[PDB]
């Protein structure tokens with residue numbers, strides 16, 4: 001028998017829904033509380049597919065070829081002069097935030113996914129955890145899973161930890177067929193491409209169409225080093241004067257920032273220049289990370305970006321989150337000495353979490369500084385670091 | 394001859410408009426850039442009248458009795474048990490933020506008061522200062538006066554200084570005739586009243602009607618000590634989940650916070666209890682202060698809450714701001730060795746500014762802790778500290 005305990009999940013995205021689904025599948029009584037008034041949106045941005053990230057969906061019968069897009073190499077290019085550093089065979093598939101989210105939400109349904117529930121307070125005793133929401137209501141559970149992302153309030157309330165700026169930001173853009181010339185489309189299609197600079201880099205790869213039937217798109221990012229203080233403050237302030245914590249979305253950019261994005265883009269080697277100048281809704285997001293010594297805090301658990309908050313470079317953040325969710329659900333599934341199992345659980349997941357953070361840190365120290373970033377370097381490959389013993393394929 | 398230089402004023406409130414008006418009066422070419430899309434609003438809150446605060450208006454023919462309201466004593470009461478600590482004769486007049494602002498704006502006019510201009514960047518050389526706005530435009534001046542208030546961006550960009558939480562917040566409420574019983578209205582009318590507690594205090598005083606012809610109102614505040622971190626974070630988070638920096642306005646309160654305000658209010662001695670329970674739009678504002686060693690930074694000057702950011706206890710913040718503006722305008726009026734005069738100017742205004750901060754700090758250490766706060770104590774009287782030699786009345 002799975003637990004007869006009541007579980008609340010705060011945060012209804014990749015980790016939240018994964019946790020909930022698996023607990024619901026297992027008979028566990030579970031609720032999701034999501035700050036968002038409606039079901040979600042990633043603004044059509046790319047996600048590199050890892051096993052862990054699509055594990056749940058595949059288990060339910062979703063065909064991989066239907067939520068993702070192939071590649072057959074990985075390219076390394078000087079993004080100023082176009083000089084090719086090198087290319088290696090590769091077969092990453094790429095999906096989109098909407099594809100994963102939309103798949104998970106579709107499976108879960110609205111009945112117990114409580115929108116407009118923004119946690120703002122939390123407290124706990126030996127039986128239960130009380131949650132308080134910004135709408136003035138409260139819910140109660142035996143266990144609460146903080147699946148509330150990089151700016152996790154749960155983690156802020158328990159530990160005082162918030163993301164620390166990493167020194168740089170990333171512009172994010174998505175192109176549709178015909179928004180760039182065919183030869184530029186062909187340059188990036190069916191490939192992950194790094195455009196490396198002396199002080200930053202771009203990445204580009206194909207992704208699925210916004211809806212089932214639509215054509216594939218090109219996803220790209222450009223990482224800029226921006227000095228904390230005046231410089232970052234001016235980049236992160238929207239057209240209305242609010243200095244935002246994480247992203248300034250396209251419809252809100254200070255026009256000056258948008259001109260700067262285009263004008264710096266003017267110096268890039270043609271095909272990258274064309275991504276930057278032709279994107280219709282580019283937007284900007286800080287790079288910030290955070291860590292945590294424990295994921296277990298009495299009856300409150302942290303998973304996904306709310307435990308260790310990653311940087312995007314190894315393209316497995318959402319995979320770390322799914323795994324956190326899966327292993328956690330399994331604990332309440334197996335339901336044998338919860339205190340003990342959770343201790344064992346967090347040890348593995350912390351080591352995974354810390355190792356992932358170290359990798360993307362090392363990656364960033366090459367990628368943001370024109371440091372050597374060698375084609376095919378196994379230390380810099382996408383994916384979660386091996387934490388388990390290897391098994392037979 | 395006043396300067397032929399071009400002056401820009403960033404921030405269009407009490408200090409901004411005062412500066413601008415006096416410079417315009419003197420022939421100086423000046424512009425105001427205000428973040429706000431429309432002319433302003435203080436949400437009908439009280440301001441105790443000081444000479445400095447109404448100096449400009451009176452000089453223009455505005456009659457004091459028409460923008461303010463009398464009192465004939467100052468009362469000191471235990472706000473739990475109603476026991477009167479004491480009363481002293483007094484003749485403070487009280488006005489409202491809207492009364493002062495509305496008077497100043499009316500005199501200045503829209504022509505050179507540029508709304509929707511939120512400064513987000515600043516830089517300067519030996520001739521000029523360039524201002525950059527959140528709308529992507531820029532203006533240029535010879536001198537820039539940072540009149541942008543407690544959360545001054547100008548001061549943030551030049552110095553890295555922002556307000557520091559002081560340990561407490563103040564609830565703010567305004568009552569109209571008939572929203573409380575007549576005997577409660579009569580209790581507070583024509584008086585400034587302190588309701589003192591073991592760990593905080595209320596103040597109440599009459600103020601003018603929202604419009605020329607309307608009846609007088611009752612303004613009140615209740616200062617609560619709220620621990621930085623989880624507690625303050627939950628108080629300062631609005632119904633939508635945003636943790637706000639300064640105020641959570643009534644239409645946005647987490648209903649739980651509003652219930653808490655009412656429920657704690659339930660323990661007060663009747664007439665204070667009635668203010669708190671009957672206010673229709675109470676709202677909350679952090680108490681935070683900041684200081685500055687210089688008000689002169691090349692060609693950028695800080696005045697009002699953007700130089701030394703006060704706490705409200707001596708009820709002369711807006712007076713400090715007017716004075717900062719007046720003395721500064723005078724410098725450009727007199728126009729004789731600007732570098733030298735500005736050095737002399739800031740010395741006086743800093744001493745005034747620091748002394749004011751020390752006073753309200755000392756006041757707070759009594760008023761938020763049930764410390765002794767003796768009726769009529771000259772050290773705790775409202776007003777700016779004497780900085781000049783005394784003159785003949």
Ligand SMILES: Cc1cc2nc3c(=O)[nH]c(=O)nc-3n(C[C@H](O)[C@H](O)[C@H](O)COP(=O)(O)OP(=O)(O)OC[C@H]3O[C@@H](n4cnc5c(N)ncnc54)[C@H](O)[C@@H]3O)c2cc1C
Pocket residue numbers: 010011012013014015016033034035036040046047048049050053117118119120147148149150151152153154170172221285303304305306312314315316317318319320321634
């Ligand atoms: C630029 C970029 C590129 C990326 N590329 C990849 C990639 O290639 N591969 C990969 O695996 N990952 C990638 N990721 C990482 C992946 O996006 C994240 O790791 C993942 O979305 C984290 O899932 P999560 O549910 O833990 O947090 P989130 O997705 O951030 O969701 C947390 C949820 O909680 C909600 N919430 C927040 N606060 C509250 C609260 N107070 N109360 C209630 N609800 C709240 C939010 O609304 C949100 O729905 C990328 C990320 C970015 C930024």
Ligand SMILES: Cc1cc2nc3c(=O)[nH]c(=O)nc-3n(C[C@H](O)[C@H](O)[C@H](O)COP(=O)(O)OP(=O)(O)OC[C@H]3O[C@@H](n4cnc5c(N)ncnc54)[C@H](O)[C@@H]3O)c2cc1C
Pocket residue numbers: 241403404405406407408409426427428429433439440441442443446510511512513540541542543544545546547563565614678696697698699705707708709710711712713714
């Ligand atoms: C609870 C309370 C009670 C008070 N009681 C009294 C009293 O009894 N007596 C008294 O004298 N004073 C009192 N005050 C103090 C008085 O309100 C302030 O000292 C005064 O309003 C400061 O004037 P200011 O123009 O310097 O700043 P503000 O009034 O804060 O105005 C600054 C202006 O700049 C604008 N701005 C901000 N940032 C930007 C930017 N980025 N770009 C462009 N514009 C920007 C804002 O919109 C605002 O209009 C009280 C204050 C409070 C909080």
